[PDB]
Amino acid sequence: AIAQLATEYVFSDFLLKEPTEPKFKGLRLELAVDKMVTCIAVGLPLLLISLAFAQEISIGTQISCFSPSSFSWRQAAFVDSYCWAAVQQKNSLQSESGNLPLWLHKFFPYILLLFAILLYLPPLFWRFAAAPHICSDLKFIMEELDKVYNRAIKAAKSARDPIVEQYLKTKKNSNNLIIKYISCRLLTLIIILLACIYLGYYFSLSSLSDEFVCSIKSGILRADSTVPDQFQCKLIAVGIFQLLSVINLVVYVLLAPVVVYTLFVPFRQKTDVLKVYEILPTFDVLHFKSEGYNDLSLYNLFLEENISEVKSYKCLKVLENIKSSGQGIDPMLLLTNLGMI
């Protein structure tokens, strides 16, 4: 049923399943925008494949050939199957548009599936090539940051009663993780553009290319006289193919700008999470994280993503908000917070 496909591919957490493993529990490792881009670009062609052959649209066979009335039931079935298999043998069939349109009409689901798999590949490469590195690294970074906050709080309390910095500093120099990331991003963009090109071509077919003339006159039937010289076959479910093709095209051409936007990692580094902790006196009072096509920018983005997980950041951020309001004091309100654990 259509509604089951709808649930499975839109309303269920399809490709939204968190890593079912104790290694990555609560950590993102994939920016939400990239995750939704991948989910769309992959699940949409699958959904359209499943829709093109839903029992509510498909009338039956994918082809019909209109054998003469003198033919039996089984001779008609033979003609149908023969021409279905003969869309490939270019010697027999003769269509106005050519053999390539028929090739495409027969294998449209396979092509959409190929595009889905190709679009799924770069995210898989990212999840299995650069995900564990950044996972471990930002895990250590959050641990060290929370520890720095606890140290600042203990120092302020004692007054009342920087290795992670060097790590981010050295990360600013290497650029392995960022070229991997922009490589996957560029790969997805290229595959999406090729898919839009193919879909725009396919949707642009003569809309009568699904009608082709087929002839069962190979082998011993060539001398047979009771068979007509040619049969008028028609590839059913081609209009549905072109419609879903134009839909996929319109969606992918809307998606491509999002991808080419995600391509610019330095421009996206905004709402500096480093400033909140910079308000604290103990840690270095410096953002020290911006303006560079290097892994530092990538870690900035992933920190801005996974930063709500540490309570230390939540308290420091609400305190920063009140500082923008300017009501109380930093160490007094920090001691009043009492959120070490």
Place this chain on the structure above:
Amino acid sequence: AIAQLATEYVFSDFLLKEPTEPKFKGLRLELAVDKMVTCIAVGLPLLLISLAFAQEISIGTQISCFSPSSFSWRQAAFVDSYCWAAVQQKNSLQSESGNLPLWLHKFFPYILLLFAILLYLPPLFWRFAAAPHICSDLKFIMEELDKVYNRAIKAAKSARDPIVEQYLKTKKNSNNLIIKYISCRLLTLIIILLACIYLGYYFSLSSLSDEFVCSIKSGILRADSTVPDQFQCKLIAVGIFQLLSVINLVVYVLLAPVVVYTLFVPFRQKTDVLKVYEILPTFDVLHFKSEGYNDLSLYNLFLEENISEVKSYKCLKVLENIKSSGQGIDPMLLLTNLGMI
């Protein structure tokens, strides 16, 4: 079976599944009215799609064409499939109402599915764009509020034997979360109005537009003489489509007032949860939360929603009720409550 669809889409918690994650356990993040509006507006077209093709209403094919008696079984099947695919090719078929009614009759399930997906989109954008922010924020707010209550109770006990305020204060100024919310609300309203327009048009079709004249005379069949000039086809299951369309129309036009009501967030801020804690002496004796198209109003609504979760509010609220009755005393009954944990 119909009853299985009934269970799945009405009696099961379809789209009522709580977030299966330790991050959001017991927190709402979606007002109950918005949740039910989304569940209705999305699951209803899905349910009607599943009903239109239930095995108990559908007689069989979606089309039948009444080929002459001299035709074989397979020639008749070919005519049926050809005309089914030829509802799109406007050159062949000639109907009184036009080709657009037939287009709509064939793709009615796809259109209902498109409307379901479009109506599901804004809630998804809300759940993935503004949900974590408000989640963390109101979580911190409830923690600070419960802590304020424990502090007031300890102070009253010692007599016997305000950062969250500034947070709500600064929230009153920014308006990001409220424009996001009213944007999703307005989006759902626009999509619902477009759906009602389309359904009112579709249901208003001539009810004979499902009968169209089709002609298999393209290709080599144009010279064929044993074929009749045209066939009388009829799109079965169109009356069912129009009936379910009028049902969906009547439901969506009842739903739209609820949406346009939810559009007014300040008017909905009622039964001030802040007053209960204002009865307490320690916390600021002021509502300080009303009368503004800002995130403060949004947080008021979400607090009024998720406020039954904190026991501190339950005790203070029953105490406020007794105060409205006027029997005992506030600190004495608070010490007699003994509900710190």
Place this chain on the structure above:
Amino acid sequence: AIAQLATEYVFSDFLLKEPTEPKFKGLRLELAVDKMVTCIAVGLPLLLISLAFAQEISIGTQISCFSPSSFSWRQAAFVDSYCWAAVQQKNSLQSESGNLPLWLHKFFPYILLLFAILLYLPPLFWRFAAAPHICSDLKFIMEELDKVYNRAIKAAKSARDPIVEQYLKTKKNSNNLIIKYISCRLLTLIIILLACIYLGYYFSLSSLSDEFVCSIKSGILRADSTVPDQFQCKLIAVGIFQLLSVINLVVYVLLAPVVVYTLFVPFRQKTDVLKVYEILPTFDVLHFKSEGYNDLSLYNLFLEENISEVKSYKCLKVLENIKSSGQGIDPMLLLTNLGMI
């Protein structure tokens, strides 16, 4: 449906299931490259088998024979089944290409399944022959290494306030595990090359070998006169077979270089994990692990794989990174880390 096969064989963790047992929890025992090579080489022919007979491509029967019109329905069915079973009996059928092409056309799915099983065998032999040995050994090695790190940290702290080496040393001499590994690697390579050869041959068939002349004239039918001398049969779904064959061929010929690369275990030993711990003063300041076709190289690779699991390595590695930056000091920053447990 095609999309279900897609999910099951690409998007689900097919052959990516971790060992569901408390013996191996978090340990790899299979290099990621070998794991993906096996998953591809095995699941791809299965996916193509499932695709070749998807309800969206398959028109129906796998064969049709075009009996004369005077034949009944059941006589036609008999002719079809007879010729289907008679692709093997070489005395009856006479095809231009020969009987071997028809043999292959009938049993193509069985051959692809055989190749899948054969490619799955060497990984199974590795997982059940050499996996527990290396599991226990590298488990002990990581335990001893973490213990060495804790000892160095305690020594540095006391200043403030080598059996695993011999094990790796003796492992450098034996070469059982490495010949097992390169034997499985060479086995997979040979099977892949044979599969590419067979697929290149099959895809290179005349594309009309699916049409063969069959004759039901054995037994009592030899004297029957109302039967024609021969029937023109055609093996449907052969073009699909050749297409998926060319796809599998193109994928396997891309895979073979990866395998022959994995064949060189010493060349792959890079990014020495031993150097990080060599920076520590307590443990032996020497890599002592390289340049040899022996089990030592294999353990180096498996350590480089499973080394992110021990936190001790994470701390020492970030410290080594800062040392490459050159900001602080080793024992002071180690005491400041405080990551013993």
Place this chain on the structure above:
Amino acid sequence: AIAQLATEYVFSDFLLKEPTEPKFKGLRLELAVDKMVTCIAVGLPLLLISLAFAQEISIGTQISCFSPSSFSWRQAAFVDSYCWAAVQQKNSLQSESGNLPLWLHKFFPYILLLFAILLYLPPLFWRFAAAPHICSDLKFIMEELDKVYNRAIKAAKSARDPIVEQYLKTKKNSNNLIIKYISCRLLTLIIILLACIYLGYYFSLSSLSDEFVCSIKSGILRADSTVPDQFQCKLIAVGIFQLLSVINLVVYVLLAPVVVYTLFVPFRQKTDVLKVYEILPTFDVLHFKSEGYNDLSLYNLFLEENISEVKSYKCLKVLENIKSSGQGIDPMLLLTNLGMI
């Protein structure tokens, strides 16, 4: 689908399910070679049964009889069913090869299933007759051995700062468990040889025995004149049967050497696990476990299997390896290990 059968019977842990019970958690009770032999010998005929009737090979019915054209559809169906049921009644049908080939062709799946069950029986008898005894016994043995190791370690530590032997000794005399084991081994061998004999006979059939002449002339039809004297039936799916039969034959004749090898339990007792603990001074310095067709040999094999489970053995074995290298000292390195628990 074929790929589902592939997953279920090869890639899933079919007959590899560990005992889902707290009594046997982590204990083997079945040597890995015997386990794989049983899994192959049982699951292979099941897999071939499931393959012989996969929807991708089976054309339809298992028989077709070619009734005359004057027959109706239902008369033809009657002829088919009659001859299918009449392969047993030897009075009616007359085939060149005889009635036994047809008997075999009809009941080939049942025979393969019978062989699968018969091969599964001896492992079941072992698992339910001698498994608990050896389970409890080797459990106690490992407990006593680990305890002996802890005692030796405590003695060495005190210097720094034998009932299990008698049990194995008395086990050397009784021979119940070993005759049970070799009885199951011999049973599996005999069943495998009988299966190879039957399969070699079946595959050696004339390949035209699937064509037989059937006659519906019993009862009132004997006087009927409009029925022909005999019908030419053909058992479809017999070539597939013979092919899968030759496959099963080739696999079983490869398996039989493995079984007859497993028959020699004393020869298999190698890589003495007793020597590792013999290196320890406390326990008896003697293997005292070899050279006898008695339960002692069986316990040696099961200990060599389940010996990696005790950490005590792992430490003593790595220490023995270093002793073969000759670097340090036994008690000092044992105290440095610190692996009592």
